[PDB]
Amino acid sequence: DEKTAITKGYEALIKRLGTGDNDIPSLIAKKDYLSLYNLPEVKLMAPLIRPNRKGVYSRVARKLVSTQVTTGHYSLHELIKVLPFTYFAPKQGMFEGRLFFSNDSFVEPGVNNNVFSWSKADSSKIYCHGIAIRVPLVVGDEHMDTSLALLEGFSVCENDPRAPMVTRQDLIDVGFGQKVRLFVGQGSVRTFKRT
């Protein structure tokens, strides 16, 4: 089934870690993200990506992974979540915070979901379709920094109600050094600062 295919793809992505060289943590410490966009598992999962929005989802995922890796601040969960899409040519378009799969399902970055859920204090337990998966490694801080896995060119900051609410479309115009509150989920509002 399409779900089972996605599950096995994610299991392969998880095992690839392997606590060794030529694996996710070594390339991370090396800050060579381009190679991540060419692994075999992403190539196997690519057909499961909706064709019409394949270019835009590749663009967004590529940007997110690049931005996170550049700073050294990252979170394995959101990374693995968005990795499958970065195996194509990025094409300009309109993104609406939902990387639809070929099966009509969805994975939205930075929100837990049945298909892929990550709970704080349960980094080892990666819940995929309500099935716990142990990670082959251990982490206590490599994941705690998710400030860059939500949006593309922004970073979380301290909460501020004065800032006005905005939507995905207007984000392009926000001036430099200007806080912008906006929903990060259902009734979850989070400020952001361009960077």
């Binding site: 378009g93 309109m94 939902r98 609410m165 929903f183 259902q186 009734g187």
Partner: protein
Amino acid sequence: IEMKKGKTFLELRDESVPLPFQTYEQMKDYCEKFKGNPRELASKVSQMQSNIKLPIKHYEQNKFRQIRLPKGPMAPYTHKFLMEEAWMFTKISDPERSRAGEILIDFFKKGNLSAIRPKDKPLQGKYPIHYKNLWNQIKAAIADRTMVINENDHSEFLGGIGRASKKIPEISLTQDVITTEGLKQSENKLPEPRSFPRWFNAEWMWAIKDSDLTGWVPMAEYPPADNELEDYAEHLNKTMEGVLQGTNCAREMGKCILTVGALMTECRLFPGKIKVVPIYARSKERKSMQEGLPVPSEMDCLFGICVKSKSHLNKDDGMYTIITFEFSIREPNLEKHQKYTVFEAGHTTVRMKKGESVIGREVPLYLYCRTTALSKIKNDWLSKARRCFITTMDTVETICLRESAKAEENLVEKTLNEKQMWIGKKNGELIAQPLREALRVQLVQQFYFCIYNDSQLEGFCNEQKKILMALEGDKKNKSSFGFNPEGLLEKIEECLINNPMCLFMAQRLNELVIEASKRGAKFFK
């Protein structure tokens, strides 16, 4: 021990008795010793049977007839709001400002509503000046950051046209006073009968459409589960909710819930004060422009402004008045919009897809004023329209419980995706759609039932059951037999007055029994 007796009680007991007996003792002796004489009783019942002429028809030699609807002008719009004919501004929601006053102030700040300036000449209206002056008053009050209105001249008028006058004490009354004023009993007026609504069909079809935005109605959460039954129930409920929330009817349901909640709260808090309320709603999602798949976006839809005149829970069982200023982008019809006064408030702008980008195109905008009355019971009744969903759910359960038992296996998805149901007549040809699309008609039937609930509709709904049961019996070749059907048709014709829903439903009943005559033998042509 004994119930000590009085006198007046015993006197009454000895007084109120049958004719031949004049004392409790005679009647008591006759009762305690009554014996059975079935022969005299048989003769008496036979005499009664002879002096009675009880007719019994069988609906086959003497069938029913089509109903004769009233004649005259069409039934005009009635509901407080404007279904389908509404233009809604929109602004992104805030959890720190999720209130009527805050929302209205925020919408005003961007200057859109302030720009609105209604023109003097009305397209079709009776009292333009008061409505336009009240509109300016609303703008000036909102500018002051207070929803209050100090001056009470226009609202008072528009609320008092129905009834307002002095009162003379009976003690100050004479015969000369009467002869001078010519006092005469207050003639009771009756509602004028109306004709078949020709626009109910369009409204219904629009209600069957799926709107761009979804999640207007709120719902509770789902508790845990401990076995398969609750799991299946939760799955079915989630499916139905996800299918229904996207409908245009749910938009009106949410608008009523929030607007009436605001009105009720303002009446309770600020009685005897003119206030201002927004006709708003709170969305949750929206179908993406690139593809129809839902993508979250919490928004706030403003369809109008509703004043609330003096409400004091005293006159007419706490009946109070309101006044509505709604938006629209659709020129009016004189026949349908008979209660609304309409203006031309400049221009607005629609926004649509254009490939990768959303563009806007200007259009003219119109302003639907209207004065109406509400009450506490109607508020309590309309504020809970979600009871229709559950009612519709019951229908689903029937189909999902009967079949599941006939074959003894889960057939829910199978029936939902295959079971065909006739919906109407297209080009003289019965249309059929799966149950997935039938649910919309059933749900809009329950909604429209609630919106128009009144005496006429209750009577007609009660009395149609007999026709439908008799016809069902006809289907299965059963000799249905009435007593006086002509009287029942007269009764249902009596119940049809000035309520679009009943006139429409009856016309459909007539066209359902015409179509069924091709397979039934209990109806005329």
